[PDB]
Amino acid sequence: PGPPGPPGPPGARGLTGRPGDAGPPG
Amino acid sequence: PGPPGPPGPPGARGLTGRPGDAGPPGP
Amino acid sequence: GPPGPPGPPGPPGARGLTGRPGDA
Amino acid sequence: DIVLTQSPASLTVSLGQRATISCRASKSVDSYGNSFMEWYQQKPGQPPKLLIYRASNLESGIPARFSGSGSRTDFTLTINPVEADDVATYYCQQSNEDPYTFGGGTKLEIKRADAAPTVSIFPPSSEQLTSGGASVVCFLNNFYPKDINVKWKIDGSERQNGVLNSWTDQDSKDSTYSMSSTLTLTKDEYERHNSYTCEATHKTSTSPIVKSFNRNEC
Amino acid sequence: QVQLQQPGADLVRPGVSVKLSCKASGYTFTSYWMNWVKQRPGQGLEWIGMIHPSDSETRLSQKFKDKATLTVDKSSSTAYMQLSSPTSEDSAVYYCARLKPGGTWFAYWGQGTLVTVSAAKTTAPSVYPLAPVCGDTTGSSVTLGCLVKGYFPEPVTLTWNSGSLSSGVHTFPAVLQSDLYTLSSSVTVTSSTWPSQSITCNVAHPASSTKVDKKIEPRGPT
Ligand SMILES: [Cl-]
DSSP: OOOOOOOOOOOOOOOOOOOOOOOOOO | OOOOOOOOOOOOOOOOOOOOOOOOOOO | OOOOOOOOOOOOOOHHHHHHHOOO | OEEEEEESEEEEETTTEEEEEEEEEEEEEEEEEEEEOOEEEETTTSSEEEEEEEEEOOOTOOOOTTEEEEEEEEEEEESOOOOOOOEEEEEEESSSSSSSSEEEEEEEEEOOOOOEEEEEOOOHHHHHHTTTTEEEEEEEEEEEOOOOOOEEEEETEEOOOOEEEEEEEOOOTTOOEEEEEEEEEEHHTTTTTOOEEEEEOTOOOOOOEEEEEEOOOO | OOEEEESSSSEEEETTTTEEEEEEEEOOOSSEEEEEEOOOOSOOOOOEEEEEEEEEEEEEEETTTTTTTEEEEETTTTEEESSSSGGGGOOEEEEEEEOOOOOOEEEEOOOOOOEOOSSOBOOOEEEEEEEEOOOOOOOOOEEEEEEEEBBBSSOEEEEEGGGTTOEEEEEEEEEEEETEEEEEEEEEEEETTTSSSSOEEEEEEEGTTTEEEEOOOOOOOO
């Protein structure tokens, strides 16, 4: 019998980050 | 001994991105 | 000899897009 | 949004020269040691085709005449030496910040030796005549520069109405342009006249190139 | 081999929702984001949004948040994008696209669907052969043509001899007049080639589900 196969393909890009803190009033 | 196994499953989603930059001050 | 098992899961993908900037 | 400004909008380059396309970002596209800038080539009728990823990495199957440099907010696509097949529109695109955004593009046109059009005239197909319409076609092929005029004459006189002109994009092989001019009349209009003529006027000759046929003359 | 299959065309009346499809093959559909991109012919590109088919997690460009709706069907490996109440500004090519696995660059692209927003009806083309003037002089080369008339909407695809005739071919971009398009193509071969060997233009019009072959014959006298 033989050894286990190679790793699968690389995964998807991560989720996009949360928005910035909406800037302070003038 | 025989052949190597098939290739694995596709990986998981990457890390979540950086939080956006703080907004500019308003008028 | 018969083939081995399927391999491990692939590595995780790249990091996500940076988030949008906050409003003015 | 990260805004990408490309310069110039259009670039004319002789074969074998260096072409340089610039891309500025409104803010940095660098993150954790990587420059998130892609370059694409797009030919008419096709999706964008990836040339360069992460600012400077050649995509598989892309010739080494293409190269990319820069970081932060300034990026450059270099083509050297330019080849005929490179006629296209090129785009930068940042992949750092949501949303993905593209530059406005740069059209690469090629400068070459002047060439005179090869002109061919076609009477209406008999099949079209059964529909009650009549188109005369004139092809003006493989000329340079792009500028050209076509005149249609019916019984020796330039007459109004029914014209459709179309120009190709620069040819990916000999770097020339071609033009198609179609004059459509009704079948009855077509059959009230006998001589049909297209005249092509081009930089390369003070003399127009004239192709003509007579209806029902073989 | 990774494959993203999109219909060539979609025509809607102003106000009627359009739903675009992108059928995926060659990879694990549920493992990767599907991105959508808009391009008006003659202009640049805009990223619309993306969706991850495993959990239907979604990110949309703020510009498109109230315009586009992204969904998937895991069973058929198809991504859909729906556009609400379309206007003439919605007429564009729409691509589906994918990042390279583990990467951040768009390596894979569908061919695009040309969305047309118009009250004009789907009309199949008339295809006319263009053979040289009856009784004309024979040179060392000969030019043939194919005139494609009276169709709607774009696009049509044109080949010669099923694409095996590629050299010496010029295919002219479609032009619209009073609600119908015209396209033409020319081919130049040696006089030894034609009419001894057969030359046929092939015209596909996916909007009307039509394919037409027209063989170019010499003109008969009278
Ligand atoms: Cl992905």
